[PDB]
């Protein structure tokens, strides 16, 4: 459909200030750009944008209470420093299915001191040599990677 | 979709179509109603819907599709079995469960007229359901089931869309019971006329129609009339072999005079090294004038021949004065007025202001049209042709575009042949005239468009390129700007298509003027010119042009196409008969007769007769008129007769003398026509030695 109508539909007369969860999967976003989001969303604690032909992160407003994000199936590449200012209280992030080439694009995530788990699957970076270890050495605060901690410790359900 | 049945088959199922067709045939009514009746039947079927009664048996029984005879039999059978009263009229469906009939109707208008009429006829006896295309229901009892309504109203909506699309949603195709008789609204006057336009033996459209509808063939009488008409005619048939073609007669009088705007053979030109920056017309004229060779010209008072000399001398001086000021605008003086005819346009006189006295005061009579006068064959055309078939000491005369890339062998062959022909054709003198026409007319077109009401000065020029010698000497040959002469254009206020605007042409020469040929011009000896020194002669004409001549001359480049097509029509044909690449051999070797000399037939390869073809097409562009059109359209018969003679095909004709008369009528004061006719006669003569059908 379209993020505008999809959102207006999910919001069954509810103000954009009392929700704790939101979903936008299987929609489309013009120019691969977010459209309709603002800082009004304060109580938001979860977000999911999947298979929406997305390619960048520029119109993302400031969200503090956000603590979990999902951007799978899109083609994002390069923009990963906004997270240190908009969602500094973020813990879980996932990017499997996006365009990621090198590690320099990942470095900014070090500033997310609240980061706990990260998920990188099917990306070009994964096809390198000794990559789990180099990432772990870059982001020490991290413990879980793609659902697996150092020593291949499977993470619990939730 | 040519017949109504297809249009009904577009949405209706073909079965209902066949049914309504048979029904219409039985009644004998127009077939235009196949659309309505079919719809009426389909509703009924989809009304039924295969519904059932309490006893697990069918509920609704159709009666409509059945033939008229069996309709009243089933109706009476049912009225009797269930012990019901017989109705006077017929119905469409008999609901068993409720033991009563149900009529159905369909009215396009969203109004209760049809329901009211039907109810009045049938009262309340049975159940009537008056559906509408736009969703309206009128009944006299409880409504039908929901599904029935939905299926009927959806079908009707689709049907109305598919009718409105085709312009068939009208009373014509969908009338009610009453408006079932459409007829042309015969008016009193139309009939009064039709009864007056009838042939003679008849006196009323009724008799003509009654005599025509029953007309029978009587071949005996028809043959008798045909033979009687075949006897009172005596159509002549003339085999040419017995009745030969007399030679075409050409008119008699003085030689046809030169008429093309720009001199070809005589014209003498000045060249100057190309300057890319200064490439504009006025700029080129300024550059040529500044060197000082041009400023030497100082014509004498007495011209060698011609009339109105003083005007021309004054205008030449004014042009030179103009360039020095770098403003190519001439003032309106007596000389320009007379040469340009600024004020010699007749003033319209009203008729209401007329009287016998005015007629007496100044003569008044219908214009005595002065048709053209006859001129004899020109003896100078051949010289122009021969000269135009020689090189010009330069190349690149006419502008041509570039050659695109290539991928397949075919393009390489096309590009090699085109390169060879363009190389041959860019060096002639005719092509120099092609360039001079394209450029000069382009400039004059863009002046008349921009500065009307100003007697502008435009040069007669062209651009070319010095030939390529061997690597020795100066390499990378340069370009050159040539200046054959100068033109001017009086006001080109072309309010309408195919207008008229006088122009004037000054052009140089180094040759003595013939009296017979150069009658148009008014030459002026103009000092001397280097090459050593040589006398000069300034040929000053006062011609006229239009929009159409401009546009077409600026498109004289067409000749290349026609000549190339003919040459490759000969070469591909000769190459196919042998299934091998024979083009270079054909071009180099194939000899094409191009004239006679010393009573013998000259011949030269095709490579040198392309020039002759090109001159033919160029001259067709130049001298085109009504005369040449009619001639070249009427000479084909003679050529076809020639071909018939070559192949022993016993051709024949009905009245050739009239054909020759028609031809000789359209030979007047146009050099090309007369020359071509003289050649056609010499041709038939030369062929009579090896053929027949021509008299001496």
């Amino acid at each position: 459909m379209e993020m505008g109508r999809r959102i207006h539909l999910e919001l069954r007369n509810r103000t954009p200030s009392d929700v704790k969860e939101l979903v936008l999967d299987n929609s489309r976003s013009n120019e691969g750009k977010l459209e309709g989001l603002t800082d009004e969303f304060e109580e938001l604690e979860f977000l999911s944008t999947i298979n929406v032909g997305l390619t960048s992160i520029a119109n993302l407003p400031k969200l503090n209470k956000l603590k979990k994000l999902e951007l799978s199936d899109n083609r994002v590449s390069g923009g990963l420093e906004v997270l240190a200012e908009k969602c500094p209280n973020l813990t879980h992030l996932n990017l499997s299915g996006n365009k990621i080439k090198d590690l320099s694009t990942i470095e900014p995530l070090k500033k997310l001191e609240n980061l706990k788990s990260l998920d990188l699957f099917n990306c070009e970076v994964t096809n390198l040599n000794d990559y789990r270890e180099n990432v772990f050495k870059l982001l020490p605060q991290l413990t879980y990677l793609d659902g697996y901690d150092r020593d291949d410790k499977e993470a619990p359900d939730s | 979709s040519k017949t109504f049945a297809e249009i009904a088959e577009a949405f209706l199922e073909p079965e209902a179509v066949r049914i309504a067709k048979e029904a219409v045939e039985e009644y004998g009514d127009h077939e235009r109603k196949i659309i309505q009746i079919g719809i009426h039947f389909q509703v009924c079927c989809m009304f039924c819907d295969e519904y059932l009664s309490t006893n697990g048996s069918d509920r609704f029984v159709l009666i409509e599709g059945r033939k008229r005879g069996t309709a009243v039999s089933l109706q009476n059978e049912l009225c009797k079995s269930y012990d019901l009263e017989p109705l006077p009229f017929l119905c469409d469906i008999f609901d068993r469960e409720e033991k009563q009939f149900v009529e159905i109707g369909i009215t396009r208008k969203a109004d209760d007229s049809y329901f009211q009429s039907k109810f009045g006829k049938l009262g309340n006896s049975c159940k009537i359901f008056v559906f509408s295309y736009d969703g309206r229901l009128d009944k006299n009892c409880e409504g039908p089931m929901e599904e029935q309504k939905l299926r009927i109203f959806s079908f009707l909506a689709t049907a109305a869309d598919f009718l409105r699309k085709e312009n068939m949603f009208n009373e014509i195709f969908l009338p009610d019971n009453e408006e079932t008789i459409i007829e042309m609204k015969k008016g009193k006057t139309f009939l009064e006329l039709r009864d007056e336009s009838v042939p003679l033996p008849f006196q009323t459209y009724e008799q003509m129609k009654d005599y025509c509808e029953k007309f029978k063939g009587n071949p005996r009488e028809l043959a008798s009339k045909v033979s009687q008409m075949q006897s009172n005619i005596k159509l002549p048939i003339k085999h040419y072999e017995q009745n030969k073609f007399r030679q075409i007669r050409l008119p008699k009088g003085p030689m046809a005079p030169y008429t093309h705007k720009f001199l070809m053979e005589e014209a003498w030109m000045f060249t100057k090294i190309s300057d890319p920056e200064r490439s504009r017309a006025g700029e080129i004229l300024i550059d040529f004038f500044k060197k000082g060779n041009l400023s030497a010209i100082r014509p004498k008072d007495k011209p060698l021949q011609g009339k109105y000399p003083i005007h021309y001398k004054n205008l030449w001086n004014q042009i030179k004065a103009a360039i020095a000021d770098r403003t190519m605008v001439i003032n309106e003086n007596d000389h320009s007025e007379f040469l340009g005819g600024i004020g010699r346009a007749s003033k319209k006189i009203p008729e209401i202001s007329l009287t016998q006295d005015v007629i007496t005061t100044e003569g008044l009579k219908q214009s005595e049209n002065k048709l053209p006068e006859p001129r004899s064959f020109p003896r100078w055309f051949n010289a122009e042709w021969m000269w135009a078939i020689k090189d010009s000491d330069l190349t690149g005369w006419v502008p041509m575009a570039e050659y695109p890339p290539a991928d397949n062998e075919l393009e390489d062959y096309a590009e090699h042949l085109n390169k060879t022909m363009e190389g041959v054709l860019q060096g002639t003198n005719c092509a120099r005239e092609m360039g001079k026409c394209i450029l000069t007319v382009g400039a004059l077109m863009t002046e008349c468009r921009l500065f009307p009401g100003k007697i502008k000065v435009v040069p007669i020029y062209a651009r070319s390129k010095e030939r390529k010698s061997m690597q020795e000497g100066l390499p990378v040959p340069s370009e050159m700007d040539c200046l054959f002469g100068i033109c001017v254009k009086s006001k080109s206020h072309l309010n309408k298509d195919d207008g008229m605007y006088t122009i004037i042409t000054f052009e140089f020469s180094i040759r003595e003027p013939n009296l017979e040929k150069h009658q148009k011009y008014t030459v002026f000896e103009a000092g001397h010119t280097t090459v050593r020194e040589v006398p000069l002669y300034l040929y000053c004409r006062t011609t006229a042009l239009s929009k159409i001549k401009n546009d077409w001359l600026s498109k004289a480049r067409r000749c290349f196409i026609t000549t190339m097509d003919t040459v490759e029509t000969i070469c591909l044909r000769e190459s196919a008969k042998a299934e091998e690449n024979l083009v270079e051999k054909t071009l180099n070797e194939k000899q094409m007769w191009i004239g006679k000399k010393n009573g013998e037939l000259i011949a030269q390869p095709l490579r040198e007769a392309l020039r002759v073809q090109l001159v033919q097409q160029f001259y067709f562009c130049i001298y085109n008129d009504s005369q040449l059109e009619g001639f070249c359209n009427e000479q084909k018969k003679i050529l076809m007769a020639l071909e018939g003679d070559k192949k022993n095909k016993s051709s024949f004709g009905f009245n050739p003398e009239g054909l020759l008369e028609k031809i000789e009528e359209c030979l007047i004061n146009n050099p090309m026509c007369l020359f071509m006719a003289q050649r056609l006669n010499e041709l038939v003569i030369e062929a009579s030695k090896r053929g027949a059908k021509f008299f001496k």
């Binding site: 379209e2 | 577009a10 209902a16 989809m46 959806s154 689709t158 397949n408």
Partner: protein
């Protein structure tokens, strides 16, 4: 926005006038078309001269004003005029300008985000370029090419449609807010509309241009041209660069945009159904119609119904002609006689019976026409222009290129006209066993002789010998044909002229209706037999790919997969509107009811009993998550509802949900047993069988205006119900009335209950009753 207010104020000003009010008030909207012509009426005699004359002027282009100001395009960049404030007299909303402006705009103007959309707009021309890039050009040669003037198609096109069907495609892919009431075509072919819609949605484009280009996209350009060699659209589009009358540019173009294999497959399928449906003597026709309707085939990505394809196609072949007849399609004026083609140029006639003794004395009646009749003919790589007269072949002029084909054409033509002594006195060999009733149906004499000639060459030689042989007179040696189809001989067949160069094919743009008999004999409003079942290959075995013969008799699968497929059809049959159904239950969040639906109870026995409980727990869980949140995948629900019958139990879930037949379904990934795609969300592929899902409720992927169209229907007008937006249609309750603007100038009433029963069946049944 404010623009809306401007439009309303403009309308108000228009209505304040008197004349405009009259013309708007009276009549319908169609008058617009009429008004569209009385305005802007001006032509020019010689356009070339006018354009050249105009271009000299300082400002030869009218242009918009506000767009130029917005784009910061000044009047003069650098001492060069571009435009000047003025108003064009006719438009009154435009300003003169010059052509130079375009160059400036082209080199420093406003730039759009992406212009790759043009590749979709002109997909035909980019296809032309892509095809041209794959042509390996070999070598120009020279020779007198033999060209035959025939009608052909010059554009390779997929899914060729009619003008009526296409018009909805433009409206339903660009202007949905003003789409007309849903047609049959749009409902049937919804994958194509979705595919076109996605490319041209939320894009800055001139909509009219795209619509016109889609019109050209779906139009196979048919032309009457000279032709040489094979006949394929891939060549005809550039034939001008392959050969003329005197030259030939050899080139291999076989493997580009194959369009002949699908025509071949369609004809093979028509042959198969025609040969199947000959078993039922009494009701072959009805069986044929049912057989055609319950079959489909895949074209590229989409799956299309065979009935529509047959209507669209133009294959003038005996197989297709009969099928087109049964459906009611009109077809060309083209006869057939075995593997031969014919076309009646002129003449007439009337049936006249004559006896033929098969062996000794055995009278067999055969009908022969009685009038002069010219006929073009066409056998493989050969053609003719023969004529008949009162049971005699008057003459035949052939222009083929092969001896064998020439002989076969001559023989089949002689048979066509029932000339020769053999028709009077049958050959000794032919017997009464083969004469008739191979399967209880009589075979006329001519087809008996045709089979005889095919059986053996010697019979063919005898038949040709039957036609008199004379001595080749002088000069006519070249125009003569021996028994071996020689160009010349000393003795030759009587009145058999021969020439070089194919006989030009005639042409006629006529459409004749033709019926068919109980024995599949196609009459055409007169005696002529255009086609029959006794002019088709005997039989052959083929493995058809990407086809759907969803009919019992025409099936090879066993009872197991058929049972599962039937169960899934039944489960999808409860997806219709109305209470106590899947969509309504989902709206009421009553997932519990789904576990007791009748179709799941019927389908439960199949489920693997050993681990039925464990599977039941997983599928019973997933539905709740899908149901409660409001984010669900209809296809997964249908896939996993059969398992929700039984009581949950405890166990480990490996990943696959088995049946009792060793066939499983994994929850999420498409497999053979159950497949689908997000592109075409209106098909379910069960063991390679296409099950159409009705369009009564949208899904996250499929969600759009189309996925609900089937649910709605028209009803009796009620002015009390509300007037809603097109988008709000998703939210309306089942069995709730609502008024709605439709198309142009139509306000209707829609009720969300699906009532679209089969129309053909009811009419057929009722009409049959009229004959008792």
């Amino acid at each position: 926005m404010s623009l809306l207010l401007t439009i309303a104020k403009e309308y108000k000003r228009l209505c304040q006038d008197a004349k405009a009010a009259q013309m708007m008030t009276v009549g319908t909207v169609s008058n617009y078309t009429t008004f569209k012509k009385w305005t802007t009426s001006r032509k020019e005699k010689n356009p070339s001269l006018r354009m050249r004359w105009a271009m000299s002027s300082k400002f030869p282009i009218i242009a918009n004003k506000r767009m130029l100001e917005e784009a910061q395009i000044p009047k003069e960049h650098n001492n060069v005029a571009l435009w000047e404030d003025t108003e064009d007299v006719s438009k009154r909303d435009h300003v003169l300008a010059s052509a130079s402006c375009i160059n400036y705009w082209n080199f420093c103007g406003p730039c759009v985000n992406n212009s790759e959309v043009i590749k979709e707009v002109y997909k035909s021309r980019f296809g032309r370029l892509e095809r041209r890039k794959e042509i390996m050009w070999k070598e120009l040669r020279f020779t007198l090419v033999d060209r035959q003037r025939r009608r052909v198609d010059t554009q390779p096109v997929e899914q060729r449609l009619r003008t009526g069907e296409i018009k909805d495609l433009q409206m339903w892919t660009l202007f949905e807010d003003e789409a007309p009431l849903a047609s049959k075509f749009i409902l049937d072919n919804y994958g194509l509309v979705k595919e076109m819609r996605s490319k041209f949605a939320n894009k800055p484009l001139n909509k009219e241009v795209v619509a016109h280009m889609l019109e050209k996209q779906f139009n196979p350009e048919s032309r009457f041209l000279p032709v040489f060699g094979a006949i394929r659209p891939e060549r005809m589009e550039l034939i001008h660069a392959l050969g003329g009358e005197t030259w030939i540019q050899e080139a291999n173009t076989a493997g580009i945009s194959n369009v002949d294999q699908r025509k071949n497959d369609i004809r093979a399928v028509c042959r198969k159904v025609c040969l199947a449906a000959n078993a039922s003597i009494m009701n072959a026709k009805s069986k044929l119609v049912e057989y055609i309707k319950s079959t489909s085939m895949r074209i590229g990505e989409t799956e299309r119904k065979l009935e529509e394809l047959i209507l669209e196609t133009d294959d003038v072949s005996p197989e297709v002609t009969l099928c087109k007849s049964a459906l009611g399609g009109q077809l060309g004026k083209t006869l057939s006689f075995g593997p031969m083609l014919l076309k009646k140029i002129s003449g007439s006639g009337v049936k006249v019976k004559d006896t033929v003794y098969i062996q000794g004395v055995r009278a067999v009646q055969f009908e022969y026409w009685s009038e002069q009749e010219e006929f073009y003919g066409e056998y493989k790589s050969a053609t003719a222009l023969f004529s008949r007269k009162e049971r005699s072949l008057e003459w035949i002029t052939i222009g083929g290129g092969i001896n064998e084909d020439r002989k076969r054409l001559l023989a089949m033509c002689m048979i066509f006209c029932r000339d020769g002594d053999y028709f009077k006195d049958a050959p000794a060999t032919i017997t009464m066993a083969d004469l008739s009733t191979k399967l209880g149906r009589e075979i006329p004499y001519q087809y008996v002789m045709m089979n005889w000639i095919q059986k053996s060459e010697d019979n063919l030689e005898a038949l040709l010998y039957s036609r008199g042989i004379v001595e080749t007179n002088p000069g006519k040696m070249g125009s003569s044909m021996g028994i071996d189809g020689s160009k010349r001989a000393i003795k030759s067949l009587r009145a058999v002229t021969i020439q070089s160069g194919k006989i030009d094919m005639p042409e006629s743009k006529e459409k004749i209706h033709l019926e068919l008999s109980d024995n599949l004999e196609a009459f055409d409003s007169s005696g002529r037999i255009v086609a029959t079942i006794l002019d088709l290959p005997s039989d052959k075995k083929v493995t058809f790919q990407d086809v759907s013969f969803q009919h019992p008799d025409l099936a090879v699968l066993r009872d197991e997969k058929t049972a599962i497929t039937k169960g899934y059809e039944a489960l999808i049959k409860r997806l219709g509107t109305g209470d106590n159904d899947i969509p309504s239950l989902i709206a009421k969040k009553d997932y519990l009811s789904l576990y007791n639906l009748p179709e799941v109870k019927l389908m439960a026995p199949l489920i693997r009993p050993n681990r039925k409980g464990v599977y039941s727990r997983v599928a019973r869980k997933l539905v709740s998550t899908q149901v409660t949140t409001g984010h669900y995948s209809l296809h997964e629900l249908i896939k996993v509802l059969p398992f929700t019958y039984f009581a949950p139990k405890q166990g480990m879930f490996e990943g696959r949900l088995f049946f009792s037949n060793d066939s499983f379904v994994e929850p999420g990934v498409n497999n053979n047993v159950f497949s689908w795609s997000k592109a075409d969300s209106s098909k379910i592929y069960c063991h390679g069988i296409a099950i159409r899902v009705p369009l009564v409720v949208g899904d996250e992927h499929m969600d759009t205006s189309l996925a609900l169209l089937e649910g709605f229907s028209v009803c009796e007008n009620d002015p009390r119900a509300p007037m809603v937006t097109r988008q709000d249609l998703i939210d309306v309750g089942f069995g709730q009335k609502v008024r709605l603007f439709v198309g142009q100038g139509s306000v209707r009433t829609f009720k969300r209950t699906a009532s679209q029963r089969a129309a053909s069946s009811d009419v057929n049944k009722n009409v049959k009753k009229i004959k008792m």
